[PDB]
Amino acid sequence: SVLTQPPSVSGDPGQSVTISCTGSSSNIGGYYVNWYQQFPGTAPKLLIYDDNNRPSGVSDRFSGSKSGTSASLTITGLQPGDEADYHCSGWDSSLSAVLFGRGTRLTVL
Amino acid sequence: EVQLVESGGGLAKPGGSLRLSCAASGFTFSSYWMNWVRQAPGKGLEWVSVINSGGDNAYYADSVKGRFTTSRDNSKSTLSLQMNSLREEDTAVYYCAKDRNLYYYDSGYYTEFSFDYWGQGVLVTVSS
Amino acid sequence: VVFTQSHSVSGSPGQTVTISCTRNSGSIDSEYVQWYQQRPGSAPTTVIYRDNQRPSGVPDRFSGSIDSSSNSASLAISGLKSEDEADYYCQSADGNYNPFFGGGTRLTV
Amino acid sequence: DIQMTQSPSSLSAPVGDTVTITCRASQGINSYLNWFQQKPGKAPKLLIYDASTLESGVPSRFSGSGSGTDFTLTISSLQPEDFATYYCLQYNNYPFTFGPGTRLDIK
Amino acid sequence: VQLMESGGGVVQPGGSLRLSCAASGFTFGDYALHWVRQAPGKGLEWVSGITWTGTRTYYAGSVKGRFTISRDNAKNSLYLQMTRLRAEDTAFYYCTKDRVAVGRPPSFDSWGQGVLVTV
Amino acid sequence: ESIVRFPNITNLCPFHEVFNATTFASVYAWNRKRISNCVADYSVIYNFAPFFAFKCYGVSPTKLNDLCFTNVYADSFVIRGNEVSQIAPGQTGNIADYNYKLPDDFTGCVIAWNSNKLDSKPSGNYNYLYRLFRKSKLKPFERDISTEIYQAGNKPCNGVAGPNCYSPLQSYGFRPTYGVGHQPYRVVVLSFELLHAPATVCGPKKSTNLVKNKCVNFNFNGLTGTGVLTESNKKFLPFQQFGRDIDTTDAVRDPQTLEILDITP
Amino acid sequence: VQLVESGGGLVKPGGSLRLSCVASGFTFSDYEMHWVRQAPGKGLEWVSVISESGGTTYYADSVKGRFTISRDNAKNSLFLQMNSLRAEDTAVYYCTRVVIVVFTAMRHFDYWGQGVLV
């Protein structure tokens, strides 16, 4: 009933970055996982839904990929205007509620 | 477009009652499912509550189940959360999120919620 | 069933001007709004052939706004040349797909 | 699909001998196995169930003892009425499966 | 694109008249055609419209069942025919193109120079 | 030519992960999964295991391919073999009245198969439970995960399983030599939902290239007819999909590029 | 305690038959009823089972879809409907019983039937 994502992820500009989210089988492993984007002092914004889908208002350089008990969000091209925390969400079939991770502070160098 | 504006928060004393509100505009509010989320300072998001499109089955989280009460008025477009018996761990920004998908039965059980549109956030602080 | 707008609009060369129509009983952006320019003694010409669009030849100055919360549609000039004074009309549909026009607004440089 | 196999195929012992017939299951049938007797032309009868227990009226000279996958059925005194065909049944999970059978003939 | 007209002139109360709009510069049968009248000094008012093939006709209220509209892709022509027309019909008729083959809610694209009609 | 126009989804559906799960749920805590934004073969479900029940109330197994739905829902649980009848529209008893009720107008399939081989234990499998008592019947797709003691008498009862009251949950018990009527059975209910929204789930019928100005046989998100499609200056609300009139389908919304095309015969 | 089978006989390929097995002496509503067939000079082959209520039914990997077991507790009878027959389906059919104490199947195939050939 707990999800795990790194508290801080870094990357040099131009290259790509990857954020992880490891859960369980009543969790990421066996239900849908969402990713939200939140800039400092703002509200979240649906970045990826149902593990792979980019809504019409999101850049194509934001890819999602769930494989087994783990999920990942990859940013290909680190335009420095996306240093914001990225939250991982899922559904715990045991407690019947929406889960949330600790968020990952993206840092560009 | 889909616009969710939140209101009604501030300081409160342990044992006191606050009452949030969420005015929605730009969609068939009497149709979708609405959620309350919160975020403590610097430490993670946390889901709080969900409501129907007809206000009969509200499902809470185990950290607030028993003190909070969610409601919605379909006449207006106002979602509401009454917070009785506040504690110090209730200090957070409270967001009002909309479900992304349409549900046919409105009194049946649905699992995997996704939030497409959020609101600014009302800060609620519990102190003395 | 009515698309009320103003009867005349002032102006000055070099500025921008705005004309506002209002659908009295019906949701705007249900249907599109069209904007036609009729000079005194000439056949009309379509300036905005949808909420926003511009035909091939209509200058880049014209712009359209379907602004929702006012139940109003607004045509903006953005550059006032000599040949710019005319009666501008706005039209739309009423769900039963009968079209309905405004009343006309005369611009006077 | 629990395939059951008995041994031996043919069998023959004079009157007054010990005879052993084994039945084997692919998976584990635990203690779930039955032994049946069939004279040529008549309806079968029940000899042991739960792999060890006899019935009311069955001859008390039929010994059955086994567990796991390999089950054994022995006898110590042959009589003219014991010369029939014997069958092992697994009832662990459907579909049930009878074995091929053992033919216990007179010497 | 040309959408010339013909048929201007006076009529009497309870009279009758017919207008005949030509075309040029575009494939004529692919689009819908409408009649829009402008009383002198007043605003535009839709009259009647028909589709690309020609199997449907949509009228306004003031012209509910007093006029009629047709077309011909052969002669590249559109026709209106008004009968029992009252004094409230004096206008400046424009035969207008669409950008659409059906155009039940119309979107007028090109217009004609117009044709005066009194009574 | 004829045209059939389906959304540009390129994801398979997570069906093999609902049937090939390890531990299913109790009928009182029946699991629900959403299926959206995917192409469903429905072939690894018609031939997955030797099935006891594949009753498709509503749509028919021949027709699910080339139908598009808004949302599909895979419910999963385990009941006793006699109770597979009660998973059907308009039925009475314990499992349908107190555990899992389906609507009289249900649409979808009910699949059910024997799981004695991996849900039964010689010592006794007490992990599966069912609700025996509830103060009221259930609505379609309601779920009572409560565990409160229930009292039928006028005298009160709280926190004790004393007389005139009784715990609501009851353990099945699954020993491998139970009768076939009382052996475990895993049930997967696929429920399909059409709504005034885009179609997310769609059978594996390849989208065709669009052709206007000709009389074609059209099949958009499943809705079929004949006629010629022409670009339409009509517009309706977003998430709306068809142009019912006076109940013909005057206009349609192209799933891939959301242009409105008017239908005329 | 008798289970008299009262059906079957001659029939052609692709045929359609309905065997009956009428019980006598025991409470039919408390016994799982099985059909099992034995080919002439061959080993027994379990084919079908029906429950004490009529709810659950199980078939072999040879009669699946072709057979239909049923029972009526008011007439105390068990029925087996065979369709789409083959020449290989020629065997002697026996109706056997299994007792259910409360849920456990005890003492499989206690009393068999006389058998009828098809």
Coordinates of C-alpha atoms in Angstrom, one line a residue, chain D:
Chain D
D1 CA -6.0 -34.7 -17.7
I2 CA -4.7 -36.8 -14.7
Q3 CA -3.5 -39.8 -16.6
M4 CA -3.6 -43.0 -14.5
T5 CA -1.6 -46.2 -15.3
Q6 CA -1.8 -49.6 -13.7
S7 CA 0.6 -52.4 -13.6
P8 CA 0.9 -55.2 -14.5
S9 CA -1.2 -55.6 -17.7
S10 CA -1.7 -59.3 -17.5
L11 CA -1.8 -61.2 -14.2
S12 CA -2.1 -64.8 -13.0
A13 CA -1.7 -66.5 -9.7
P14 CA -2.9 -69.9 -8.4
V15 CA -5.5 -70.2 -5.6
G16 CA -3.9 -69.1 -2.4
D17 CA -1.3 -66.5 -3.3
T18 CA -0.3 -62.9 -2.7
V19 CA -1.0 -60.6 -5.6
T20 CA 0.0 -56.9 -6.0
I21 CA -1.4 -54.4 -8.5
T22 CA -0.2 -50.8 -8.6
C23 CA -1.8 -47.6 -9.9
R24 CA 0.1 -44.4 -10.7
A25 CA -1.1 -40.8 -11.2
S26 CA 0.7 -38.0 -13.1
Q27 CA 0.0 -35.3 -10.5
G28 CA -0.7 -36.1 -6.8
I29 CA -4.1 -37.7 -6.1
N30 CA -3.3 -37.5 -2.3
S31 CA -5.6 -40.2 -0.7
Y32 CA -8.2 -39.8 -3.5
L33 CA -8.4 -43.2 -5.2
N34 CA -11.0 -46.0 -5.6
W35 CA -10.7 -49.6 -6.5
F36 CA -13.4 -51.4 -8.5
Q37 CA -14.0 -55.1 -9.5
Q38 CA -15.7 -56.2 -12.7
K39 CA -16.5 -59.7 -13.7
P40 CA -16.9 -60.2 -17.4
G41 CA -20.4 -58.9 -18.3
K42 CA -21.7 -57.6 -15.0
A43 CA -21.8 -54.1 -13.4
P44 CA -18.7 -53.2 -11.4
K45 CA -18.5 -53.0 -7.7
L46 CA -16.6 -51.0 -5.1
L47 CA -13.7 -52.5 -3.2
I48 CA -11.8 -49.7 -1.4
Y49 CA -12.3 -45.9 -1.2
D50 CA -10.1 -43.2 0.1
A51 CA -7.3 -45.6 -0.9
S52 CA -7.5 -47.6 2.3
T53 CA -11.1 -48.2 3.6
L54 CA -13.3 -51.2 2.8
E55 CA -17.1 -51.3 2.5
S56 CA -19.9 -53.2 4.3
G57 CA -20.1 -56.5 2.6
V58 CA -16.8 -56.5 0.6
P59 CA -14.5 -59.5 1.2
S60 CA -12.1 -58.6 4.0
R61 CA -9.2 -60.2 2.2
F62 CA -8.6 -57.2 -0.1
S63 CA -5.8 -54.9 1.2
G64 CA -5.3 -51.5 -0.2
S65 CA -2.6 -49.1 1.0
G66 CA -0.9 -46.2 -0.7
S67 CA -0.5 -42.4 -0.8
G68 CA 1.1 -39.8 -2.9
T69 CA 1.0 -40.9 -6.6
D70 CA 1.8 -44.6 -6.3
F71 CA -1.0 -46.7 -4.8
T72 CA -0.9 -50.5 -4.1
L73 CA -3.6 -53.1 -3.9
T74 CA -2.7 -56.6 -2.6
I75 CA -4.4 -59.8 -1.7
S76 CA -3.3 -62.9 0.2
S77 CA -5.9 -65.6 -0.5
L78 CA -7.2 -66.2 -4.1
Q79 CA -10.7 -67.6 -4.5
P80 CA -12.7 -68.5 -7.6
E81 CA -14.6 -65.2 -7.4
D82 CA -11.5 -63.0 -7.3
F83 CA -10.7 -63.7 -11.0
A84 CA -12.0 -60.5 -12.6
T85 CA -10.7 -57.1 -13.8
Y86 CA -9.7 -54.5 -11.3
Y87 CA -9.8 -50.7 -11.9
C88 CA -8.4 -47.6 -10.1
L89 CA -10.2 -44.3 -10.2
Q90 CA -8.9 -40.9 -9.3
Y91 CA -11.5 -38.4 -8.0
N92 CA -9.2 -35.5 -7.2
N93 CA -10.5 -33.1 -9.8
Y94 CA -12.6 -33.3 -12.9
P95 CA -12.5 -34.9 -15.3
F96 CA -12.2 -38.2 -13.5
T97 CA -10.0 -40.9 -14.9
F98 CA -10.2 -44.7 -14.8
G99 CA -7.1 -46.7 -15.3
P100 CA -6.5 -49.3 -18.0
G101 CA -7.2 -52.3 -15.7
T102 CA -5.5 -55.5 -14.4
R103 CA -6.7 -59.0 -15.5
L104 CA -6.3 -61.4 -12.6
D105 CA -6.7 -64.9 -14.1
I106 CA -6.6 -68.4 -12.7
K107 CA -3.2 -70.2 -13.1

